[model samples]
Target chain A: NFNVAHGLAWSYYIGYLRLILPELQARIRTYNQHYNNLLRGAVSQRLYILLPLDCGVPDNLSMADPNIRFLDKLPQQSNSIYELLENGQRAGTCVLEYATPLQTLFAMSQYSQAGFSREDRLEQAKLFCRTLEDILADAPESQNNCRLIAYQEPASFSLSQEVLRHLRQEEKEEVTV
Target chain B: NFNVAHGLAWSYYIGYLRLILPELQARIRTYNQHYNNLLRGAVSQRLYILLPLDCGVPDNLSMADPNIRFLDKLPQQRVYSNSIYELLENGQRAGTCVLEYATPLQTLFAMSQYSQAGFSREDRLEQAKLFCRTLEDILADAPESQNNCRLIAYQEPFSLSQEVLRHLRQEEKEEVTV
Candidate 1:
């Protein structure tokens, strides 16, 4: 006997990443093109990308980070990643709800492709795809999540003790005269 | 920016399933639990038990119809059944673990002949209860780890053609004729 419902979620989770990432890329490219088109006119637009908590947001928090939030649960019975965001949009909020990242990669995919040419877009998209492959390859052996290697250093300053603890330890490690 | 690292199929996919079939069981049990658990036990065993084509030494088409010989792709970089092996590896790394998701009814919907799909009433009941006891057996062992590792299970397999329901009806019909 098989749990078809669970199987769908699992299969969709594993398989759909491959299926949808390309689609999502194309969708974003279309959005970018549309955004450019609209800019030439006077339509004001905002794209709010909805993702699970740790999924990346656009680098500029001031522009759109408020739109992103963490999810306590992944997709489940009532609605899919697509459906939840679809409902959010249906409720009249700006939610870029379509771009759920590949679960393991947590790939950064929702950025506005405002100024990118096809070549630049493809080039940037490579990092996202490559990172996913690297994570998939690394995961079998590495015992941790696949964070972008480019992000190994602390991304920000914080007052929290855990952040402070690292600062305190690093200060002790090397002292400049 | 996101780390892109916090998600591991091994951790998220594998761990998530153990937590959810109860989510699923509640669903199917919400569908109602009288369905056989034995079939679920076997299917769950089959699902968690990972392999690639000809990874096992066997001959002939009938065996090909056996535990596998029918995954569509192979990765130079990974297991074809990512969740199952990932869990096995996780358990190996941790040294002990056990998990379950799905009940007998869900399994029957997932398995069986579909257009020819089937189960018997009282017969289905016996098989289901016997399977439930088996599932109960599988539920017995664990390392007491707080984490759940799950691979995959279907969410809404119901709409995938009326053949499965039609098949079950036929099975029910056969008992009266017999």
Candidate 2:
């Protein structure tokens, strides 16, 4: 049991990444269709589960984002019932939709480095696991409804601007050997 | 799998602490037997796994303290063999050993503010795990580890004067119960 727990703490990352890589890839593809060049390379991101009603996530985010760019690009909240509030405010149940409210977790970005070997990614995944465990122990409250998560936003190598630009260029060469 | 990993990351502390607490307690008991409390509160500590020869564990550490204070004070490393190292000048790899340093109650206090919110034994150990995890992450985040938690100058808080030790006790007592 000790060894199992210890192994999990030290090496559980790559498994999670492998499981989620497809989902992250699709999200990036959809995001690029709507917004491009904005998220080209590695953009470090943290995940969190938030309570919309209790958390004024939008209002709080507005205050945090001086440029309001973050406000504009906020992820949609998960499906949950919402009700009108006393001051004409709207409230909803807990959600993961457009969930930007989660922060304060340890950062996982070594996975974001370019052309990493599978072994390297596996090691990073372990570090990610360890860091997440660290956060869980440190912030017991966060373990509640809004536990923070970490992952790098996905990037599509095929959808890069340079690739698209080259495909559209008249000077591009076509050689069949 | 995510849940399992998460549980491991969070719960590994308690298990590891449970498995190792007796040894740690014995080390403390031995230290207090030789040197006498003012040392009986929460302490901050770090654990390291190293190569015996590569780390100069026997030499550098001996020079670091001719009195062998650190060597005496160091936690017992676990057993691991290295048949490969004998070909070279090395004997074996260093196993995991804990080196504890007394810390301000306030450091534990900050970690305590969330749960149970007390500087009890369990709380301090949890703080130690959390602190250890932080160092591990920082080390991974920067392989060079410019932010590695090792101090430039290791102090002998373990060998402090009686007056200083008394001060630590009084200061600690005023801050937290037990």
Candidate 3:
């Protein structure tokens, strides 16, 4: 039931390393490919979900040269979103896609942390479920519509990066890199 | 399968507050009876649970004199348990117990701030549950018992001076004014 409402809150960063917008998604494809191999296959169960429009996802990333040639390598969002994500893991929605602007709900569900007791598990499961439901309820659900129904922070992206990287490297995806 | 493991912790508090030193049970009952009229029968949910061992339970407490102060006014604990409940409410466990603790978790779970969203409520419940469990756990096996668990701090908790003064006003409980 847990959902990612903000795409920017869950971005892969390799595109930034090169200090410019990637020519293609293929470059990110390459990094994901390399990251998984380094970590060994299937280390983390990660799911990559396609995001909808107006979700705060960047059109392109400013890359870093690694040679320290450019001081302004970071792609600026000109936003409070980035700041909130870094300092606080709990920022906003995982997904805000909605059937209607005010009558939608969405949720994300996971049972990975099995060590937690039943009460805790139910709580976690419900959180994921309810959050997702709310997003779906709030969204307009029409094609090409715009809404920032929920916000994802920095921790969301960081975790997603690790998971996607694992997939490419370990699963042996045929990537451009 | 998703137990918060808090009740597991409560088992421990029951042991120290009631099991190791069962005598506190008598004290609590006596106090409850004494203050029943003033409190009008029911006690605060928090106080009711620890009524057995907590001498801090009010007994005939009244602003009229000594009996109705907070636990801080009575005998204080020399060690860590000295202020365990206070610490639980306003200090160490504050993060785990605060409205903020529950609120953020709520925001994380709900993913949205809309009132209809039920996501955060569950997490807030868990936070509350964990707090009570942890408090009971610390009290049950508190290390203070090793030194006889005999409370000695004066002008701190369960202070009788007010009671002494009150009775002096109306000839209630017997006590030395000094």
The C-alpha stretches of model 3 lying farther than 4 A from their native spots are A1-171, A174-177, B1-118, B142-178
TM-score: which candidate is best? 1
Per model, how many backbone clashes are there? Answer: 31, 6, 61
lDDT of 3: 0.27
Return the candidate ranking by DockQ, descending. Answer: 2, 3, 1
Stretches off by above 4 angstroms in model 1 are A1-18, A21-23, A40-177, B1-9, B12-15, B23-178
Best of the two (1, 3) by TM-score: 1
Tell me the deviation in Å of residue B89 in model 1.
Answer: 35
List per-prediction Cα lDDT, in the order shown: 0.28, 0.30, 0.27
Work out the TM-score per prediction. Answer: 0.26, 0.21, 0.19
* Higher-scoring candidate on DockQ, 1 or 2: 2
lDDT of 3 by residue, B40-99 (tens): 331111112221111122323333222223332112211212111111222222110000
Worst 10 residues of 2 chain B by lDDT: B80-89
Candidate 1: global Cα-lDDT? 0.28
Q: What C-alpha lDDT does candidate 2 achieve relative to the native structure?
A: 0.30
lDDT of 2 by residue, B2-67 (tens): 222223332332223223433544454444444335423233122222211111223233243232
iRMSD in angstroms, per model: 17.0, 13.1, 16.6
Model 1 DockQ class: incorrect
Q: Candidate 1: deviation at residue B74, Å?
A: 29
